Amino acid sequence: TYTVCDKTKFTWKRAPTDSGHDTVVMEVGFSGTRPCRIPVRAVAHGVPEVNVAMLITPNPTMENNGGGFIEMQLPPGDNIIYVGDLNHQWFQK
């Protein structure tokens, strides 16, 4: 089912982590859905008011090994990535 992948199909391989080049990465794994459109969003400090998912890699896809690595960020501050049903807070600094 290559398409908008269902929010609960991925898993926390690696929660939102500061990439290293001064941005954020997150790593997610699929259960079956092939090249999908990964609904990766982020909310400011566990508060879904404004989406803070300004994606350094704004076109993530899940493949034969899963979404893999993605890149997100928002001007230094509290972010958290809600990868569909997945989520994990972390102020990016």
Swiss-Prot record:
Cell compartment(s), UniProt: Virion membrane; Host endoplasmic reticulum membrane
Disulfide bonds: C5-C36
Highest taxon listed in the record's lineage: Viruses
Membrane association type: Multi-pass membrane protein
Signal peptide: none
Stated name of the protein: Envelope protein E
Native source species: Langat virus (strain Yelantsev)
